[PDB]
From Swiss-Prot:
Intervals holding TPR repeats: 6-39, 48-81, 90-123, 132-165, 174-207, 212-243
Transmembrane segments: none
Location in the cell: Cell projection, Growth cone; Cytoplasmic vesicle; Cytoplasm, Cytoskeleton
Shown stretch of the complete protein: 208 to 495 of 573
Family: Belongs to the kinesin light chain family.
Tissue expression summary: Found in a variety of tissues. Mostly abundant in brain and spine.
Organism lineage string: Eukaryota, Metazoa, Chordata, Craniata, Vertebrata
Subunit structure: Oligomeric complex composed of two heavy chains and two light chains. Interacts with SPAG9. Interacts with ATCAY; may link mitochondria to KLC1 and regulate mitochondria localization into neuron projections. Interacts (via TPR repeats) with TOR1A; the interaction associates TOR1A with the kinesin oligomeric complex. Interacts with BORCS5. Interacts with MAPK8IP3/JIP3 and NTRK2/TRKB; interaction with NTRK2/TRKB is mediated by MAPK8IP3/JIP3.
Gene source species: Homo sapiens
Name of the protein described by the UniProt record: Kinesin light chain 1
General function of this protein: Kinesin is a microtubule-associated force-producing protein that may play a role in organelle transport. The light chain may function in coupling of cargo to the heavy chain or in the modulation of its ATPase activity.
Length: 243
């Protein structure tokens, strides 16, 4: 959701940014923000959109503190002008959670992700696909913290929403299953992770989360378990499938 007066500005800036032309994109943002402030004040939903666009240009440049500052600046204009439960506040909370998250600041990124998830269940419902994507986001933040009980739950809940609203053959259903089989492996629930990898391997091969990748995961799972013969058969099958 981007207004009409900012549709073109957002496009061209995100094209200049994609091409590595920051020295052009950055002044465009700052000028459009200058013109917007002059014409509609600082606390306007359109100023927060340009601060959110500039925070993306700054993320590409690796100016992460400056992106965090502009995202915190936009989040404040949106809670003021739109409300603490608007789809636009979850969007900026997720950008901030992904920022902190990529920077190894999972403990700080987590409350923003939980808040962005709560707003999503208010506007979309507790069983919507976009809430399942947020539970895969939040399960990853908690995994990097070792909170596996919450991780296992967020992944299981995301997988129900995914196969009930999108069917058992969705590409997300395989990645959620892969992400869950990884936290099971991390804990040492080899039996549970093994069942998930065999489920991923079966659907991937009948269709064609790769088969060669899944054969590497199972060969790794079997080597860690102590099943030496069983691991060699899958590492030699993973090699024969790379070709």
């Amino acid at each position: 959701e981007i207004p009409a007066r900012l549709r073109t500005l957002h496009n061209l800036v995100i094209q200049y940014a994609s091409q590595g032309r920051y020295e052009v994109a950055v002044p465009l943002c700052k000028q459009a923000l200058e013109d917007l402030e002059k014409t509609s004040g600082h606390d306007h939903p359109d100023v927060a959109t340009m601060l959110n666009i500039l925070a993306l240009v700054y993320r590409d440049q690796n100016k992460y503190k400056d992106a965090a500052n502009l995202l915190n600046d936009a989040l404040a204009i949106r809670e003021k002008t739109l409300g603490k439960d608007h789809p636009a506040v979850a969007a900026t909370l997720n950008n901030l959670a992904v920022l902190y998250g990529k920077r190894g600041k999972y403990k700080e990124a987590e409350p923003l992700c939980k808040r962005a998830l709560e707003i999503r269940e208010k506007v979309l419902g507790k069983d919507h696909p976009d809430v399942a994507k947020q539970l895969n986001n939040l399960a990853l933040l908690c995994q990097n913290q070792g909170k596996y009980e919450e991780v296992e739950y967020y992944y299981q809940r995301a997988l129900e929403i995914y196969q009930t609203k999108l069917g058992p053959d969705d590409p997300n259903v395989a990645k959620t299953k892969n992400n869950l089989a990884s936290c099971y492996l991390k804990q040492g629930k080899f039996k549970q992770a093994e069942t998930l990898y065999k489920e991923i391997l079966t659907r991937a091969h009948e269709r064609e989360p790769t088969v060669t990748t899944t054969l590497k995961n199972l060969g790794a799972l079997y080597r860690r378990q102590g099943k030496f013969e069983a691991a060699e058969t899958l590492e030699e099958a993973a090699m024969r499938s790379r070709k």
